[PDB]
Design a protein around this ligand. Structure first.
Ligand SMILES: *[C@@H]1O[C@H](CO)[C@@H](O[C@@H]2O[C@H](CO)[C@@H](O[C@H]3O[C@H](CO[C@H]4O[C@H](CO)[C@@H](O)[C@H](O)[C@@H]4O)[C@@H](O)[C@H](O[C@H]4O[C@H](CO)[C@@H](O)[C@H](O)[C@@H]4O[C@H]4O[C@H](CO)[C@@H](O)[C@H](O)[C@@H]4O)[C@@H]3O)[C@H](O)[C@H]2NC(C)=O)[C@H](O)[C@H]1NC(C)=O
Ligand SMILES: *[C@@H]1O[C@H](CO)[C@@H](O[C@@H]2O[C@H](CO)[C@@H](O[C@@H]3O[C@H](CO)[C@@H](O)[C@H](O[C@H]4O[C@H](CO)[C@@H](O)[C@H](O)[C@@H]4O)[C@@H]3O)[C@H](O)[C@H]2NC(C)=O)[C@H](O)[C@H]1NC(C)=O
Ligand SMILES: *[C@@H]1O[C@H](CO)[C@@H](O[C@@H]2O[C@H](CO)[C@@H](O)[C@H](O)[C@H]2NC(C)=O)[C@H](O)[C@H]1NC(C)=O
Lengths: 174, 55
């Protein structure tokens, strides 16, 4: 996965998330919910649209070229005309094949980049108030209602006002 | 080879005459003469072999 997130530490993609590409899914005292992250979603889309536009652009009109099918045997001059065209086609087919390969690998990998970029953005956002559970989820060590979750997404989460509670919940015995 | 009544044949030749140049024909006979000239240029122009219906 190169960044190791999609099919790496995230087990599955969310088939029911059809309002974005990347997003959040949560559970708290007020129930469960789900909402997309439009920043990272749009970022992946912009990069892909960019390369897509860049691949799919037209070429020059081509007008009177050489004959490529021959009704009679002519030998040496025909041999060459056939050889030139064949050479051309092999090279263009190659370029196409390689192009797709490189592009696709890169698309796979840039979308994996955006996944980890979102994860790390959140991990930093939450400071010392939550722990990485390993599967792409965080364990929040304080009460965090729907309003609280809506400050984490949307990046308006001041960790400092929860810090005290979280530390006490994190550092007990069992 | 017999073609439609005839066991003879005509060889076709072409000539380009530049501006300031002159077409000069000396012939002692057997000449299939030109009646004039085609205006010859070059551009988005070609030819294709096909039996596809033009629509
Ligand atoms: C050098 O070597 C070659 C080969 O040996 C030879 O070529 C031969 O040339 C002769 C004459 O130049 C030519 O003769 C006939 O040509 C017509 C075609 O005959 C073919 O018919 C079929 C096609 O329809 C084909 O499948 C056959 O296999 C056959 O080959 C034929 O119609 C002509 O007949 C008309 O013309 C003569 C006068 O030339 C008349 O006498 C005939 O009655 C006939 O006229 C009638 O019909 C016409 C309309 O068709 C009408 O207008 C007229 O009023 C009348 O009703 C020729 O007999 C051979 O075909 C040709 N052979 C090949 C293989 O090409 C050269 O001649 C040789 N050179 C020398 C100097 O000998
Ligand atoms: C290229 O163009 C020129 C344009 O003038 C052309 O020149 C002409 O050539 C012919 C052939 O030589 C000349 O005609 C000759 O003139 C006299 C009388 O007409 C004779 O000397 C020739 O008659 C011969 O014919 C006999 C039959 O076989 C021979 O046995 C004998 O030797 C006789 O001499 C012939 O008719 C003509 O005068 C000139 N024209 C001018 C204006 O001077 C030339 O022929 C062209 N080239 C070709 C056609 O290949
Ligand atoms: C998150 O920030 C955005 C800033 O645009 C706020 O988006 C608004 O969301 C409310 C619903 O809670 C809508 O009624 C508004 O129309 C949205 N405004 C815009 C401009 O999109 C949102 O309020 C913030 N999050 C919370 C929890 O308030």
């Amino acid at each position: 996965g190169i960044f190791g997130a999609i099919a790496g530490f995230i087990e599955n993609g969310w088939e029911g998330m059809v309002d974005g590409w990347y997003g959040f899914r949560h559970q708290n005292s007020e129930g469960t919910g789900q909402a997309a992250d439009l920043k990272s979603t749009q970022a992946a889309i912009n990069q892909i649209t960019g390369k897509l536009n860049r691949v799919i652009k037209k070429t020059n009109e081509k007008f009177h070229q050489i004959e490529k099918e021959f009704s009679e045997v002519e030998g040496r001059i025909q041999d060459l005309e056939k050889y030139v065209e064949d050479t051309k086609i092999d090279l263009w087919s190659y370029n196409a094949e390689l192009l797709v390969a490189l592009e696709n690998q890169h698309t796979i990998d840039l979308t994996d980049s955006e996944m980890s970029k979102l994860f790390e953005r959140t991990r930093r956002q939450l400071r010392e108030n939550a722990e990485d559970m390993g599967n792409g989820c965080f364990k929040i060590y304080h009460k965090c209602d729907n309003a609280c979750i809506g400050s984490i997404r949307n990046g308006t989460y001041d960790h400092d006002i929860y810090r005290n509670e979280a530390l006490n919940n994190r550092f007990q015995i069992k | 080879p017999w073609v439609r009544g005839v066991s003879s044949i005509i060889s076709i030749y072409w000539t380009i005459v530049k501006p300031g140049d002159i077409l000069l024909i000396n012939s002692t006979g057997n000449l299939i003469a030109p009646r004039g000239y085609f205006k010859i240029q070059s551009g988005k122009s070609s030819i294709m072999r096909s039996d596809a219906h033009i629509d």
